[PDB]
Design an enzyme around this catalytic site. Sequence first.
Site, PDB file in Angstrom:
ATOM      1  CE1 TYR A 140      -3.419  -2.752   0.364  1.00  0.00           C
ATOM      2  CE2 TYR A 140      -4.631  -0.836   1.199  1.00  0.00           C
ATOM      3  CZ  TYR A 140      -4.617  -2.145   0.708  1.00  0.00           C
ATOM      4  OH  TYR A 140      -5.777  -2.822   0.515  1.00  0.00           O
ATOM      5  CE  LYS A 186       1.832 -19.100  -2.027  1.00  0.00           C
ATOM      6  NZ  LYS A 186       0.687 -20.011  -2.183  1.00  0.00           N
ATOM      7  CG  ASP A 218      -2.524 -20.721  -0.990  1.00  0.00           C
ATOM      8  OD1 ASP A 218      -1.972 -20.688   0.111  1.00  0.00           O
ATOM      9  OD2 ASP A 218      -2.167 -21.529  -1.847  1.00  0.00           O
ATOM     10  CG  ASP A 242      -8.145  -5.037   1.081  1.00  0.00           C
ATOM     11  OD1 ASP A 242      -9.061  -4.394   1.619  1.00  0.00           O
ATOM     12  OD2 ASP A 242      -8.103  -5.257  -0.151  1.00  0.00           O
ATOM     13  CG  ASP A 246     -13.970  -6.871   1.556  1.00  0.00           C
ATOM     14  OD1 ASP A 246     -13.958  -6.045   2.500  1.00  0.00           O
ATOM     15  OD2 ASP A 246     -14.345  -6.539   0.412  1.00  0.00           O
TER      16      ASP A 246
HETATM   17  C1  LIG Z   1     -11.080   1.674  -0.252  1.00  0.00           C
HETATM   18  C2  LIG Z   1      -9.814   0.801  -0.082  1.00  0.00           C
HETATM   19  C3  LIG Z   1      -8.547   1.640  -0.310  1.00  0.00           C
HETATM   20  C4  LIG Z   1      -9.742   0.126   1.303  1.00  0.00           C
HETATM   21  C5  LIG Z   1      -8.424  -0.636   1.550  1.00  0.00           C
HETATM   22  O1  LIG Z   1      -8.005  -1.353   0.680  1.00  0.00           O
HETATM   23  O2  LIG Z   1      -7.848  -0.503   2.763  1.00  0.00           O
HETATM   24  C6  LIG Z   1     -10.996  -0.748   1.639  1.00  0.00           C
HETATM   25  O3  LIG Z   1     -11.006  -1.839   0.739  1.00  0.00           O
HETATM   26  C7  LIG Z   1     -10.859  -1.247   3.055  1.00  0.00           C
HETATM   27  O4  LIG Z   1     -10.576  -2.402   3.208  1.00  0.00           O
HETATM   28  O5  LIG Z   1     -10.888  -0.335   4.025  1.00  0.00           O
HETATM   29  C1  LIG Z   2       2.968 -24.554  -3.463  1.00  0.00           C
HETATM   30  C2  LIG Z   2       2.801 -23.121  -4.019  1.00  0.00           C
HETATM   31  C3  LIG Z   2       4.174 -22.545  -4.397  1.00  0.00           C
HETATM   32  C4  LIG Z   2       1.783 -23.047  -5.187  1.00  0.00           C
HETATM   33  C5  LIG Z   2       1.553 -21.598  -5.653  1.00  0.00           C
HETATM   34  O1  LIG Z   2       1.596 -20.698  -4.846  1.00  0.00           O
HETATM   35  O2  LIG Z   2       1.349 -21.396  -6.944  1.00  0.00           O
HETATM   36  C6  LIG Z   2       0.408 -23.621  -4.794  1.00  0.00           C
HETATM   37  O3  LIG Z   2      -0.109 -22.820  -3.700  1.00  0.00           O
HETATM   38  C7  LIG Z   2      -0.567 -23.525  -5.960  1.00  0.00           C
HETATM   39  O4  LIG Z   2      -1.603 -22.701  -5.824  1.00  0.00           O
HETATM   40  O5  LIG Z   2      -0.362 -24.197  -6.933  1.00  0.00           O
HETATM   41 MN   LIG Z   3      -2.196 -21.980  -3.959  1.00  0.00          MN
HETATM   42 MN   LIG Z   4     -11.029  -3.805   1.587  1.00  0.00          MN
END
Ligand SMILES: CC(C)[C@H](C(=O)O)[C@@H](O)C(=O)O
Ligand SMILES: CC(C)[C@H](C(=O)O)[C@@H](O)C(=O)O
Ligand SMILES: [Mn+2]
Ligand SMILES: [Mn+2]
Lengths: 346, 346
Positions: A140, A186, A218, A242, A246
């Site tokens: 950010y 990650k 992930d 972020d 959500d």
């Molecule tokens: C509007 C946007 C910049 C903001 C962020 O990414 O922090 C919103 O998504 C939040 O999460 O407060």
């Molecule tokens: C193991 C990892 C490096 C790989 C990635 O991040 O691409 C896996 O999470 C995927 O989504 O295939």
């Molecule tokens: Mn993955």
């Molecule tokens: Mn957000």
Amino acid sequence: SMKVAVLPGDGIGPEVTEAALKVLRALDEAEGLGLAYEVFPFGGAAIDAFGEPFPEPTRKGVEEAEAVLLGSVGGPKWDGLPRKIRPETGLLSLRKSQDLFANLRPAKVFPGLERLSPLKEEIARGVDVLIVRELTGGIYFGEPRGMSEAEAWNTERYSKPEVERVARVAFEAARKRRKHVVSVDKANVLEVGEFWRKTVEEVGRGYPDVALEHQYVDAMAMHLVRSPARFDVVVTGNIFGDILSDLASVLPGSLGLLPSASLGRGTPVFEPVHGSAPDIAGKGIANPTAAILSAAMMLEHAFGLVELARKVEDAVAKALLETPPPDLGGSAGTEAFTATVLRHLA
Amino acid sequence: SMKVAVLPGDGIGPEVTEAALKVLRALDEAEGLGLAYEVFPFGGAAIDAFGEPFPEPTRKGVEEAEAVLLGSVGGPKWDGLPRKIRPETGLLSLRKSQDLFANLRPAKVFPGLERLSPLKEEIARGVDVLIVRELTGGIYFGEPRGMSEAEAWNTERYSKPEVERVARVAFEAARKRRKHVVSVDKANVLEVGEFWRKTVEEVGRGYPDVALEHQYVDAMAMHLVRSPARFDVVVTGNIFGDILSDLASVLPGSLGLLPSASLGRGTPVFEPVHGSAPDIAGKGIANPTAAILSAAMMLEHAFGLVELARKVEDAVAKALLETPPPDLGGSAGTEAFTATVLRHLA
Ligand SMILES: CC(C)[C@H](C(=O)O)[C@@H](O)C(=O)O
Ligand SMILES: CC(C)[C@H](C(=O)O)[C@@H](O)C(=O)O
Ligand SMILES: [Mn+2]
Ligand SMILES: [Mn+2]
Ligand SMILES: [Mn+2]
Ligand SMILES: [Mn+2]
């Protein structure tokens, strides 16, 4: 005293903020809180009045107050502005100027309301997760950043003290909750993830009474949907926080439900997670729950009024069960929903 | 004919890969496909034998074959090694060396299996989303990248040709499905997002028959849970694609259900989106669905065997509703489940 800088912002921002203001005024009268508030321009409204989303009088108002109650910012009216003055940059500028490095976003399914979740009841039940999101660093704010006709670039980066401080907030929050932190990165792919994990692990040594677990981002998105009830505190960097906050927002069943607190060195900020919803502004339907519960977070965190914050939360929970807004399949307008919250507070 | 390089990998990789091969032999038998394949050491298996996860002979085999059927990599045995020489890194090297910029992950809820989804039935019904993830650029491979005692940094960068080529895959994929693409970025905060959105928009103009929509990554994580049914093709960058594809994977109810195709300049790669699941290795319970559907994507994308890929998919679908595996409330082990797929293929 209770000095509050109120920044309504754009779209539904002023409507939901006024709803949260009615809750605060009704508490002021009943408890004798000595609330004093002042409204300042911020966001699109400030761009149109001053040429910048976070203008001088607003910056001064924020620095002089004990807390900030913030609405929402943005809308298509300001699309295409130079990045330096977008409503979104004003928001980052607010967070940054007060160095509010710790963003707290609680996702909670109130007992009895599992029905509203898009998830099956047994999965949504008992969900009570606190996302601690690093807010003033990472991609950010990282440099270099830019774009030419041939490419664009942004830098995801963290320093040791930046990770330390947000990690410490997560550990302190966990100590008061269920003594469990999941740190999210990650690290199997990125140096920053590696560095993040190493530092969170070191901070963790200062808190041997709090269980520490690490999850890849992930896999974490997935866990937040399959088994969200097993999480207590989740700590992560800016963009991952972020995204995941959500995602957690859907657990209660709607985005108009999540409140937030932004804490650090300067004036703490309390804002509903949702955006400005330009499509529904001035139509008397916006769910003011997020704003109300953010005023609740302000009472607890900025003023130390834990008991009062819980009364509001309890009132809101009853109001959601009794007369839900339209975004939860109900017919209660913003005004009527606020009145319902008011009766329970009595 | 059909020349395949097979990389079983670690943990359940060999078992699930073997299961997929039984499906492939059955089709080579029943259809006479001219299947020729060689098995190569990869991941932790390659580390034990060659001291690296992606050695010369495995590289050679990959490059001489028409398609790769890869199992999975990783395991506790190799934790502790520097990130740079991990089995997970060997996976990134494989992808980079063949410049497989387009990762296709189809998250689908087969008709009748809505019950297994963590989502309520009506939300999970008819879910059919293809995630097109940019796989060889972005932060995963961005320079500069590094770490010191004080901080760490990684670079989220994209060039115009990189966004253009992945975007095109997205549009072509849509054009074969329901003519809708959602491009996903964080343009409101990130220069790279603004650049991504602008480039996808220009490519989009060459596809006037496909509908194009842009969503921020945090809002998108929410939509994949509240209304996955409204999406067809989703296209995004490396890390955003990694997060949203794991998220989508939970929809049908398991890990073991998602296949993927990695397509680009060199030899295409087909692998199940799941880890090596170290604990259940050699126990014969691992769900081979994802490996089988990966060989099915191989048939389609590598050999243009659309119809056959589809027969394989319908077979797997009925096998799931008939004899579910442990991971989906059933008790059908690896081999018994495969035999059910084999039985339906005739
Ligand atoms: C509007 C946007 C910049 C903001 C962020 O990414 O922090 C919103 O998504 C939040 O999460 O407060
Ligand atoms: C193991 C990892 C490096 C790989 C990635 O991040 O691409 C896996 O999470 C995927 O989504 O295939
Ligand atoms: Mn993955
Ligand atoms: Mn957000
Ligand atoms: Mn025939
Ligand atoms: Mn080549």
